[PDB]
């Protein structure tokens, strides 16, 4: 199962 | 910062004449991921070769597999070429049955 | 024993022939069990695996939503890299990730990950405890401090628990067959002559998993780790793995040389004498 963060956020 | 692949040409079983097998070629420990590697018989590229996905170990190195089908015979020669940024020429890796 | 979960992704730009390549995979073990290609026509996650494949389309577009999700982040990482380095655009550059969790015997969480790199080295890595965050450079906690303001750090460690241990569990159940199997290596030694004056003795191991093996020479019980020659871990491309030791040895003497393997497979290790 991939990871999923609600927002993705960046460097 | 690169890094030299660490090439090993080499069959999936034990080679026996006359049996079918895979002639694989394990690439390791490079970077960056781009690479080249043939499969020669007798000098020349076997064209139907397929790799594995890329993937990397815990220092980031990345390996490859390449394998193909064939048969092997008491005359026939095989070998792994590779190309990488790290080579100042390609390297050509003979098969051996015994390593 | 233990077990892992592993998704390595890799994503390398190619400057003047378009956008970013990105090249995920997954591993159970030494197992992989699926793959996503960008260059790829499918622009789907892949079964790798012949135990993977029974799961239904509500597993498969889930996967490939957060696996492109997850392939734009990382394309972005590297236009701030680049920016945050003052590299140059003309120059290839690769960010690489990895995260995935340690399970036991019994089924419960041991460790996680979740880490960067970029152009080999390390970036950003979540440590161990999971509550905080490695940062190797000054470009990387920038990152840090944007990081631990957003609090990804406690939402990934609730991933880890939560959501990569109990798929881990599930996929150890439907492949239990294939997956928790261990086959032992067939160990066999060959003999190359090279002059009058000296030979070669190699030890092999062949068709075991997982990959973790120990090859070992011995001299009348004195451990000979010198002019031994012993060649990285390779795949047999079917599933298992190889390996070889081998010695430089003077004839007539090869019978005082004594190889030695040690696998979870095997009940007790085993010595080889020529």
Not at chain 3, 51 to 74: C, F, L, M, N, R
Not at chain 3, 181 to 208: N, Q, V, Y
Request: some cysteine; glycine content about 6%.
């Amino acid at each position: 199962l991939y990871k999923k963060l609600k927002r993705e956020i960046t460097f | 910062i690169q890094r030299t692949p660490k090439i090993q040409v080499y069959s999936r079983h034990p080679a026996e004449n006359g049996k079918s097998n895979f002639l694989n070629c394990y690439v390791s420990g490079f970077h960056p991921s781009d690479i080249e590697v043939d499969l020669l018989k007798n000098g020349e590229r076997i064209e139907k070769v397929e790799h594995s996905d890329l993937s990397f170990s815990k220092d980031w190195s990345f390996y490859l597999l390449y394998y193909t089908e064939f048969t092997p015979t008491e005359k026939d020669e095989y070998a792994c070429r590779v190309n990488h940024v790290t080579l100042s020429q390609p390297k050509i890796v003979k098969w051996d049955r015994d390593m | 024993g233990s077990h892992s979960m592993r998704y390595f992704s890799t994503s390398v730009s190619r400057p003047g022939r378009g956008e970013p390549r990105f090249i995920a995979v997954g591993y159970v073990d030494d197992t992989q069990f699926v793959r996503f290609d960008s260059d790829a026509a499918s622009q789907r996650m892949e079964p790798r695996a012949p135990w993977i494949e029974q799961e239904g389309p509500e597993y498969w577009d889930e996967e490939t939503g957060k696996v492109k999700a997850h392939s734009q982040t990382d394309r972005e990482n590297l236009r701030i890299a680049l920016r945050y380095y003052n590299q140059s655009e003309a120059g290839s550059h690769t960010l690489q990730m990895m995260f995935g969790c340690d399970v036991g015997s019994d089924g419960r969480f041991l460790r996680g990950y979740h880490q960067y790199a970029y152009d080999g080295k390390d970036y950003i890595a979540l440590k161990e405890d999971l509550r905080s965050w490695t940062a190797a450079d000054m470009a990387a906690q920038i990152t840090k401090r944007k990081w631990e303001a957003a609090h990804v750090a406690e939402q990934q460690r609730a991933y880890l628990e939560g959501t990569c241990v109990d798929g881990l569990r599930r996929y150890l159940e439907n492949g239990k067959e294939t997956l928790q199997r261990t086959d032992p290596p067939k160990t066999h030694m060959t003999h190359h002559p090279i002059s009058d004056h000296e030979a070669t003795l190699r030890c092999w191991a062949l068709g075991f998993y997982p990959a973790e093996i120990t090859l070992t020479w011995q001299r009348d019980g004195e451990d000979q780790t010198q002019d031994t020659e012993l060649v990285e871990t390779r795949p047999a491309g079917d599933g298992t793995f190889q390996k070889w030791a081998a010695v430089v040895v003077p004839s007539g003497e090869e019978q005082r040389y004594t190889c030695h393997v040690q696998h979870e497979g095997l009940p007790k290790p085993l010595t080889l004498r020529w």
